[PDB]
């Protein structure tokens, strides 16, 4: 390809080229409740946004890199975005909810 890609390009849950409205519409059509996807942040270069579908709405969470190869979400630190997804498949992300299926990059 000759490109240097985002380090998360090719991960099933990563969408590097959609809008926030497209994220909403994908989660409501392709996704199901507890589905999720990750986008680069629209407003903070270098950050990422995790979108999560509950029974009644979509929630957006900030993931921010540290200077030392880690990522911060909810005041906790993880070695990768994949580790954040592993964490919230086993611990509730919103009361009553875990991460279930990714919305695959379309």
């Amino acid at each position: 390809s000759g490109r240097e890609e985002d380090p998360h390009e090719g991960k099933i849950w990563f969408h590097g080229k959609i809008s926030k409205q497209e994220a909403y519409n994908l989660l409501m059509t392709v996704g199901q409740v507890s589905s999720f996807l990750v986008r680069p942040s629209d407003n903070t270069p270098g950050d990422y946004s995790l979108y999560f579908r509950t029974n009644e709405n979509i929630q957006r969470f900030k993931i921010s890199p540290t200077p030392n190869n880690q990522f911060m979400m909810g005041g906790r630190y993880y070695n990768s975005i994949g580790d954040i997804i592993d964490h919230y498949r086993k611990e509730q992300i919103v009361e009553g909810y875990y991460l279930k299926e990714p919305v695959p990059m379309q």
Binding site: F61, K62, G74, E91, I93
Partner: peptide
């Protein structure tokens, strides 16, 4: 803005 997770 952004939501905070349950275990924040």
């Amino acid at each position: 803005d952004y939501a905070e997770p349950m275990d924040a």
